[PDB]
Design a binder for this molecule. Structure first.
Ligand SMILES: [Ca+2]
Length: 450
């Protein structure tokens, strides 16, 4: 009497990203030396000349502060390519950096390989430099885009031991004779050919989509699934933000946020406060989706000291948050499908195990912590190997012998962190009120915020 799957099932790579939670973007290039956000394609390669670039420093700090993947911008809008591409002369080849022998993608890949940091790349579809970037040279431009994809993803010296985990692309394009058409499908085919199950963020129906929110905040609900016919560059932002309750492909709505107002380094900018980073975390990772956080190196080729300190503060916040699971080993009562799907699985500390029930909704789970504990966060997780299901739930707590509401939500997904006013309680209920199929949970935890 097995539990049948519901909805589209995530790939192993999609589940890996969801589990990894945190990725870093790196914006570094001509724009850094021109103090700007968006280049013209006429920037002087002579100006690309960082005094003391240390990619190993980038990677080491990222790894130490909890990031599991690093996506490197290899060619932004300006079209300046940060590795010595065979396919254009507008690259590091003609810059003074490393006596003109530099390869930023190689230097980051070497470092990332040493630290087992997953790798991704961005090459801007919209290219302000390339003479091929015109409606009348579209086939030519696409062949150029494709050739660089091939150049990067085929070279075993690029990547984390030759492997890329995410290719990232937007869909923006010029106007008039610059309104170039992208051969997205041929690009995705190339990616799969060269890097197999590598995730793709795009505007089309790939494994990752944009969350569609500039602040990095997930919608509520957040279904990690979509109908591919409702995406493209004209996709509705509300649709990206919530996903589709009847979506037919598993899709991660990635939250992309810069640690500063701009994506490139600007001296008169500062990293987001710990407070703001914490809010973003709860509204992204705490809603079941990864945070991709941009950190821009300065003109010296180094992360800003304020930004480095902030990442350590953020890592310390998270490590303190999760230090004590106040629900671990609590007694649970409620309906359960079988012994294999017992209530005790919710707090047993095992990744092997889950709870499930086909009882009529609402389903009530009650935890007895065994002594009064002080908390302000509850975490719930579904088993997405059987598909996303829960659509509404609420949480109640017994405070001084009287039941009161703690918080409520809609989707759970891979992981939901729900904050409430701090309480001291010994008993808690999780009540599932709506679900697309019979609910499972793999874990209920409780924490106190630092
Ligand atoms: Ca478990």
């Amino acid at each position: 009497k097995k539990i049948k799957p519901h909805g589209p099932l995530p790939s192993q790579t999609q589940l890996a990203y969801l589990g990894d939670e945190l990725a870093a973007f790196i914006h570094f290039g001509p724009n850094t030396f021109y103090d700007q956000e968006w280049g013209t394609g006429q920037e002087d390669p002579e100006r690309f000349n960082p005094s003391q670039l240390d990619a190993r420093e980038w990677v080491r700090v990222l790894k130490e502060t909890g990031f599991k993947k690093l996506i490197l911008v290899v060619k932004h809008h300006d079209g300046f390519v940060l590795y010595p591409t065979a396919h254009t002369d507008y690259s590091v080849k003609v810059s003074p950096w490393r006596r003109g022998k530099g390869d930023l993608l190689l230097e980051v890949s070497q470092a990332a390989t040493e630290f087992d940091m997953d790798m991704g790349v961005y090459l801007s579809p919209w290219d302000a430099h390339s003479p091929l970037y015109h409606v009348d040279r579209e086939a030519d431009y696409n062949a150029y885009y494709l050739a660089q994809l091939k150049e990067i993803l085929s070279n075993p010296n690029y990547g984390n031991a030759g492997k890329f985990a995410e290719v990232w692309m937007d869909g923006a394009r010029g106007e008039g004779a610059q309104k170039v058409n992208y051969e997205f499908e041929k690009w995705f085919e190339t990616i799969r050919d060269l890097q197999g199950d590598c995730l793709i963020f795009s505007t089309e129906g790939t494994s990752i989509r944009w969350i569609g929110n500039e602040r990095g905040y997930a919608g509520d609900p957040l279904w990690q699934k979509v109908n591919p016919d409702k995406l493209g560059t004209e996709a509705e932002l509300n649709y990206l933000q919530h996903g589709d309750p009847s979506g037919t492909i598993f899709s991660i709505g990635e939250a992309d946020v810069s640690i500063r107002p701009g994506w490139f380094y600007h001296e008169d900018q500062d990293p987001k406060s710990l407070e703001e980073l914490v809010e973003i975390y709860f509204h992204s990772v705490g809603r079941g989706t990864p945070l991709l956080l941009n950190i821009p190196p300065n003109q010296a080729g180094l992360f800003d000291a304020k930004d480095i300190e902030r990442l350590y503060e953020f890592a310390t916040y998270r490590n303190e948050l999760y230090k004590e699971d106040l629900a671990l080993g609590a007694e649970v009562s409620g309906p359960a499908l079988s012994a294999d799907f017992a209530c005790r699985h919710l707090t047993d500390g095992l990744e092997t195990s889950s709870w499930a029930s086909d009882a009529d909704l609402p389903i009530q789970l009650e935890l007895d912590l065994g002594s009064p504990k002080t908390f302000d966060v509850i975490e719930l997780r579904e088993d997405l190997k059987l598909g996303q299901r829960i659509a509404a739930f609420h949480v109640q707590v017994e405070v001084d012998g009287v039941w009161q509401e703690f918080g409520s939500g809609h989707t759970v997904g891979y992981k939901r962190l729900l904050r409430g006013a701090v309480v001291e309680a010994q008993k808690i209920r999780v009540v599932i009120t709506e679900s697309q199929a019979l609910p499972l949970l793999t874990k209920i935890s409780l924490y106190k915020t630092p």
